[PDB]
Design a binder for this molecule. Structure first.
Ligand SMILES: OC[C@H]1O[C@@](CO)(O[C@H]2O[C@H](CO)[C@@H](O)[C@H](O)[C@H]2O)[C@@H](O)[C@@H]1O
Ligand SMILES: [Mg+2]
Length: 580
DNA sequence: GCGATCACGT
DNA sequence: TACGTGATCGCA
């Protein structure tokens, strides 16, 4: 069974062919400034294993790695590229990434290692990484004999599976999606992650001090109002203090007891003064624990930068996710938490943070896909879309639209995009079911094209077995035919929403690629730092702001051409908070 | 360790 | 109502 390969003590010419499956192993989940434990190369001349100290010190190998004409097939090339960047080594010529290929073929498989991807094609001559390295406390690099065969088997799998995966991608019309979108994007993400974002740690530490004080205060007030101490951070103990010791009304229940979600607490506020305090305490506690303490834990002490990792092969819709730290969920709704952004600053003196965001990209994408005359016209006039919906569903002139009417029309717009049900619309607007249903009905009368799209997309999902996005990304929906109403309904909402969220994902990804090409042509020093679903955050010399104000929005607006215009707003300042 | 519940983002 | 990450609790 053992697979044959050369355990090389030195790099040789035949190891540098112009086409090879390459494995540059980084076992640490967070690959930033992490160790490379081994290298495997499989090509026309055979299978090879190279120790990193050797390979990475060989100028011929390093040259081969950076030679864009020497093509490499890999799995999670971003991981290798970044780990190499920290060692001052450039990786070029990656023409096939099995992780991204598998992700595009079926995001639902959750492929996160070569073995998982290989299984899709009935290839099982490779072990799962977890089986080799273990997990958690037991996770460690095996002895060279075991490590070497594993890396060679992974490279061998990649070598064998490239053609099969490319053939299916082609059949799915996703060949360009991999080659012209995801693979180029992977390199851009590597640059962004490697660059990192500078943090004003002293500012965060000061906020932490101010929060600790406020928490202690509110914390005491809570015990005083409850005439006793308990773990406020325990939905369990809290549920007892509120619904048992204080007799507060039980408006909502959970799977294991009473609900203490902010949602319910808001309704309970009128009954007792402790509720407001619990809400406030949670607000502050989230800021302290997740953001202040959290960020401080991952900031690099030497550079004061945080280096997130953008998981490019995880979400079912094509969006990216961000981890350790997640820089796509930094507070902004509430002013107090929003101030956390004042701690994200430019990495160099006299540089500024520039942020550009698409305005209502989901609803604009919906107008395009559904080809709804009323909705397309609304955007062609660049109308306030929520006021417009209110005018239509409540039958009133612009002047007759009250704040509450807009607030509700807004909730309906978001619900439509999410495939909201008459019930979930009530839960959100805290209204009835038949009422929320009447709203939805009024919406479809005003936007018949959208109603038709929602009906047609669900039928298409049932017929084909999947739905697709603008750039041909796909998501299988087997539950669309489930005879269990709830399971089927969730699938139906996904059928309606995925093409919208997914196409919006496609668009900003292409914008990022187009943008970097533009930045290079103009030789601007400006560069991307983050992507937050419908917005791009960059940093650049103050002298480049005027050029960026015109360049960034244009590139983002022209990424794709829809039946309605794409609109991008932008702001810049001395900190992320100020880029408003 | 892991499911349940909470809260942060688009 | 769509899509995420993660801190904390509590029993295994
Ligand atoms: O390197 C990112 C890439 O690796 C996968 C596994 O193939 O995720 C690993 O790394 C992430 C970043 O540290 C972790 O969040 C995740 O837990 C770990 O398995 C892919 O999912 C991802 O695309
Ligand atoms: Mg926006």
């Amino acid at each position: 069974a053992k697979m044959a390969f050369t355990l090389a003590d030195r790099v040789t010419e035949e190891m540098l062919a112009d086409k090879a499956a390459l494995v540059v192993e980084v076992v640490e989940e967070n690959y930033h400034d992490a160790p490379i434990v081994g290298i495997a190369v499989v090509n026309e001349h055979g299978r090879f294993f190279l120790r990193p100290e050797t390979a990475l010190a060989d100028p011929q190998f390093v040259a081969w790695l950076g030679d864009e004409t020497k093509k490499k097939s890999m799995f999670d090339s971003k991981r290798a590229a970044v780990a190499l960047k920290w060692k001052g080594i450039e990786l070029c010529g990656v023409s096939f990434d099995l992780l991204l290929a598998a992700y595009l073929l079926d995001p639902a498989q959750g492929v996160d290692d070569v073995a998982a991807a290989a299984k899709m094609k009935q290839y099982e001559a490779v072990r799962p990484d977890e089986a080799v390295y273990g997990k958690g406390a037991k996770r460690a690099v095996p002895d060279e004999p075991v490590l070497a065969e594993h890396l060679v088997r992974k490279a061998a799998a990649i070598w064998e599976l490239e053609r099969p995966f490319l053939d299916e991608l082609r059949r799915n019309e996703q060949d360009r999606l991999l080659v012209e979108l995801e693979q180029p994007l992977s390199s851009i993400l590597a640059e962004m992650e490697f660059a990192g974002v500078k943090v004003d740690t002293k500012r965060l530490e000061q906020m932490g001090k101010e929060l600790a004080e406020q928490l202690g205060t509110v914390e005491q007030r809570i015990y005083e109002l409850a005439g006793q101490e308990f773990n406020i951070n325990s939905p369990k103990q809290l549920g007892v203090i509120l619904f048992e010791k204080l007799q507060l009304p039980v408006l909502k229940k959970t799977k294991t007891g009473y609900s203490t979600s902010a949602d319910v607490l808001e309704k309970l506020a009128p009954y007792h003064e402790i509720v407001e305090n619990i809400l406030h305490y949670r607000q502050l506690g989230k800021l302290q624990s997740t953001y202040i303490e959290g960020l401080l834990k991952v900031v690099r002490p030497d550079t004061k930068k945080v280096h997130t990792i953008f998981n490019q092969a995880l979400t079912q819709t094509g969006r990216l996710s961000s981890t350790e730290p997640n820089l796509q969920n930094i507070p902004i709704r509430l002013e107090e938490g929003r101030k956390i952004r004042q701690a994200f600053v430019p990495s160099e003196s006299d540089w500024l943070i520039f942020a550009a965001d698409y305005s209502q990209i989901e609803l604009r994408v919906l107008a395009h896909i559904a080809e709804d005359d009323n909705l397309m016209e609304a955007f062609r006039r660049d109308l306030d879309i929520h006021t417009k919906t209110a005018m239509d569903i409540f039958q009133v002139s612009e002047d007759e639209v009250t704040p509450n009417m807009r607030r509700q029309a807004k909730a309906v717009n978001f619900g439509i995009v999410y495939g909201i049900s008459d019930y979930g619309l009530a839960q959100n607007l805290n209204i009835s079911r038949k009422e929320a249903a009447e709203f939805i009905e009024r919406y479809f009368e005003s936007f018949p094209g959208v109603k038709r799209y929602m009906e047609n997309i669900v039928q298409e999902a049932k017929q084909k077995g999947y739905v697709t996005t603008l750039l041909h990304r796909r998501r299988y929906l087997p539950d669309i035919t489930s005879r269990n109403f709830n399971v089927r309904s969730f699938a139906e909402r996904m059928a309606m929403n995925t093409p919208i969220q997914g196409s919006a994902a496609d668009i900003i990804k292409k914008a990022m690629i187009d943008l970097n090409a533009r930045l290079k042509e103009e030789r601007l020093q400006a560069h991307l730092l983050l992507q937050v679903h419908d917005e791009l955050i960059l940093e650049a010399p103050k002298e480049e702001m005027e050029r960026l104000c015109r360049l960034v929005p244009e590139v983002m607006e022209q990424a794709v051409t829809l039946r309605v215009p794409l609109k991008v707003d932008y702001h810049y300042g001395s900190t992320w908070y100020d880029a408003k």
